[PDB]
Design a protein around this nucleic acid. Sequence first.
DNA 1: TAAACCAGACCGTC
Length: 748
Amino acid sequence: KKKSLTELISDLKGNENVVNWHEIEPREAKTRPMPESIDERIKAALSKRGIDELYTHQYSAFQYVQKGESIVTVTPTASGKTLCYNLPVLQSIAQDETNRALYLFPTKALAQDQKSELNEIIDEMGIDIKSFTYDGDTSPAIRQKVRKAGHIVITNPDMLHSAILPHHTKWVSLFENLKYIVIDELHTYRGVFGSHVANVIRRLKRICRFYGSDPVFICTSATIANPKELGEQLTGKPMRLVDDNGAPSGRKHFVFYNPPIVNKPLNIRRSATAEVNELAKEFLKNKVQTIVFARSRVRVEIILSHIQELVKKEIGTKSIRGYRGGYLPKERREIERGLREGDILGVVSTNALELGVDIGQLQVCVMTGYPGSVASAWQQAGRAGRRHGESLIIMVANSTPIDQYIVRHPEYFFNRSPESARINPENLIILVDHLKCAAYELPFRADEEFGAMEVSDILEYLQEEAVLHRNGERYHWASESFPASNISLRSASQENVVIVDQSDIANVRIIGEMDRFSAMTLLHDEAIYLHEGVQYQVEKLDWDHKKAYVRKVDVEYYTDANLAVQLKVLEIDKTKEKSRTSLHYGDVTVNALPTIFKKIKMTTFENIGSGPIHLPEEELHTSAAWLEIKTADEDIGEKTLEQLLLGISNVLQHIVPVYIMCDRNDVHVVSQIKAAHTGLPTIFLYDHYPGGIGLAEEVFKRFSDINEAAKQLITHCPCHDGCPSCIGTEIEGIKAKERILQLLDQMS
DNA sequence: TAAACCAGACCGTC
Ligand SMILES: [Zn+2]
């Protein structure tokens, strides 16, 4: 016992199950001096916490933005990313106190964090710079003061859409003196949400043009493939990308781990959960600060329970905490603060800590399986690192085909560049909604460009629908309606369910939240809800009022459930037949039958019983485009057919979002071996947004191009048969590429 | 898989 971190690294270097060891070289801090033009008060205030020099990226950001060139920097929060935009903004306000700035954060909690840091930095100076947040949580009594006195206004894209722009006449103070627009995590604004936010930015730019100000955009993004391009397409201005990371970095060991095989005939490996529990045990017992990511909320709670039980003998009780989005605000702000100050030794988290919140800088990262994407893997890995010491990142794979392929071929992960962020701000639905909003704000002249080109046709269409009216050359708002209130930027999300502890009537308290869709299987009438190790049992799920009345409970087991998802075609309104192929387009419904739930003993993971789930069949009514394979009696084997359809669906999931310029989560591609109406093998592609937003329609239009791009992708990737980047490894035969390509050629 | 957001201002009433 009593080992150090280097001793633990050696014990992992040898005598282990490691399948790859990737060493990331240290980096000495590269710096430039504090600019002379910086206000003396700001230089003294930055002497606090030892910021007498600037990193190369911080200095480069300040210099680019001083000239007026908009920038996007790929700088982690640990490398001093907030200074890259706080320095120019605070400098500009210190020079001329009449200057203002908008900060755009993807969440309200991040806005609060940035306000707090800005308040500290400002208080260290002698200047009276007022910063405020203006979001749905801002009480309306203070909003009047905020519109007037706020030098720095910290908002959401959603609040900007819904509150600030449609009431620009109430914000004249900053729109006339706007110098900087900060966008904190650009990569979150991708896909359909990214399209909405791009149009919101267009409206903000026209508002700023009206008040005679052309602010400069300072953006931050994660390490995606196209940060400069996403920033340019999102803000509509040319961007200067800031690459170099002048922050100091130590040695980093990113290691691949494959759990041992427990039975050789049945060919079954040990759970990544158990190996992760024991690895984090050996690291936490030696007082090494560790983060553990897991793929789901239930598995996060499982790992918390196991780790705390097997570590409290040596470490104690109050050193390991959990983290997931369903936690209360106060509760997880406390968790973040504890991780930052260093008095929380370990944390078991979902992907929620991929967000650039300031939780300090961990020593060890343990991933329970591949996070899902290369970008997520690298961002999860960046949570472990030191200014000068060493750090480990253990990716413990599980039984997934993708995990096992990443294990058996580590060069496939280390050579692949991160994924790309694609938006299409010219989606007809989105562009029409935001054109109505923009016309409500300012009368929209016909020849003035909104983004790329002119858009007089949609203006004429809106005039025809009694919503706009042309006077001279400008289209005025001709409707009694407020458009911004009817348009949600992220209409995927709905109201959440609130978890209410009724354990005693005198201290009834709200303990957490959960999205409505997940509560069907996680909060049903007898489920067990695990809140950071605290056990509750759902007494009753008030589904219509989105409430879950629960009580405190101590049991041996936990609850899990899975949804039986079926898809039905309603009416087929478009179709195209070609030999052994027929591609239809129509309306479909996605039903989720809850069926049953399982009791699983927490300690042994054994099944100890089951139960029923009486909940309404949640259904999505949405447009879809499907292809079915017309076959002769000279058919193919059933299981071979399911494998082939699975491969085609993988290639479609790869190609469709790339060609239609959306995100992988914006469209769902499902496969059926025998559809209900036809009995033929069918692949459906449908956008999950309510009602639909033209993704399936564009897929039906360009499906021939999609199939050709799919064939090209299958032919050109350097794989032996299939990889997760093309058709997948689940195909068992030895001629996977050939069979899939034949089905594609037959699908002309 | 997880996670996230949403007029200003006045009127009518207790
Ligand atoms: Zn491949």
